[PDB]
Amino acid sequence: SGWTFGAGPALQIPFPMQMAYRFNGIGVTQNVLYENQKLIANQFNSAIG
Amino acid sequence: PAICHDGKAHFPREGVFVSNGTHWFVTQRNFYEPQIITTDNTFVSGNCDVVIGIVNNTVYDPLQPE
């Protein structure tokens, strides 16, 4: 649900969209994630591993 | 995540893409305030071959009719 459950009722949202908006929060547009999603997913998985 | 008007991706400027199941709208994050998807409300980035989940739809040209 992203951060929506920290304010009121929990609102569903696909994780790629949530991550794109977390990028948009730091000043990088949505297109970066939607064009490198495989790379971000692999990097995050490797970091968690 | 994006719209593919003519073989070319389209991303929301500030909002999300939603739909009634027949028509596609661009709206805010906290309210369902639908607006017709126009080129002034979306920015082009990509070539409609890397984004996953992208739907075709159409956008509205505000200059072609006149």
Ligand SMILES: *[C@@H]1O[C@H](CO)[C@@H](O[C@@H]2O[C@H](CO)[C@@H](O)[C@H](O)[C@H]2NC(C)=O)[C@H](O)[C@H]1NC(C)=O
């Ligand atoms: C990433 O997810 C995959 C599955 O979605 C995990 O794959 C299995 O993980 C278990 C748990 O260690 C292993 O016993 C299996 O051998 C894995 N199968 C394959 C085909 O890899 C994978 O472990 C996840 N990544 C991490 C770092 O846990």
Ligand SMILES: *[C@@H]1O[C@H](CO)[C@@H](O)[C@H](O)[C@H]1NC(C)=O
């Ligand atoms: C969704 O919006 C469209 C706008 O063109 C409207 O015609 C339709 O009745 C609405 N609802 C559904 C279920 O499509």
Ligand SMILES: *[C@@H]1O[C@H](CO)[C@@H](O)[C@H](O)[C@H]1NC(C)=O
């Ligand atoms: C969008 O239209 C093109 C042109 O016919 C087609 O090749 C493509 O498969 C369509 N995309 C989707 C998601 O239907």
